[PDB]
Amino acid sequence: MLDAFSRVVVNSDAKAAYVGGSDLQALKSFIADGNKRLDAVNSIVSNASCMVSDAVSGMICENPGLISPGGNCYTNRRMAACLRDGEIILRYVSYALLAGDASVLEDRCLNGLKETYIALGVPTNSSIRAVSIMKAQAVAFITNTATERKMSFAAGDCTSLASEVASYFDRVGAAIS
């Protein structure tokens, strides 16, 4: 029933879909550690809005030249377009977490993004700094070692999935280098 998931992500439009109780058992059996993995995507997307608001402001907090007149976080549409570019990669890395691969990440999101950013005047090493905060923010939510928040979970480790997103976030940074 991942073909039912992949047909959602291939139709290139807005379409809602959801899973009942029988096909969720087909989801939990086909994907290994599905009790672990579906926790790990839920710990990110419950706090995905604070992750994009902290990290690109932490990119401002280390690179203050982007909110200069002439910088790339000026002219607040362009500032929101950096926020819109913040939120697409978190939904794409969570589906890359959920499917267990990066084959949906490469074609739909990572293909030609380096050529897109050097044609749009986007400072790509600044976005490397913004996405390295995301590699730290996803690990502290998967391991539930966030300093300000702690969600309830079942007992056990998640260090395979904590290391798997570091494989996925380094694929974004290698794609835009």
């Binding site: 607040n76 549409r77 362009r78 929101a80």
Partner: protein
Amino acid sequence: MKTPITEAIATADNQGRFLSNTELQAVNGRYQRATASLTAAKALTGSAQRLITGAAQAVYNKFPYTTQMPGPAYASSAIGKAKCARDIGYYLRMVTYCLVVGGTGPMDEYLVAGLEEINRSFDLSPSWYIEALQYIKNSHGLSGQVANEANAYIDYAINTLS
């Protein structure tokens, strides 16, 4: 709260009338300035976070005394500035609310109604407040007729204090 739909209804009711072709044309023009006003207050929320305190620093760098004066009615200490992320956010809120309805509805009853009593008996003089949204009218990042419709209810709020 006076929507341009609702005064086609209220000026068909005080004469006791069905909705004729006169008032059917006035709600068609509300359906013609619909899309050119709905991109305004959507994307003004999309750039709202810069516009609150980026306009506040366009008041204290106009008026240095407002951080320096000893008084409760200024943003001098840390408690007056917390009111200043609220009391000019209400001006930024109702200019989005006017572009939903296509008229000057919500700020006519929530904001401007009974305002000199609030102004004179707090000494909150609107020489800060006109310049509080004068940064908004030129640094919103909007072009075309989406600019002129978003700037249409800003300078209605200017002229009510001026």
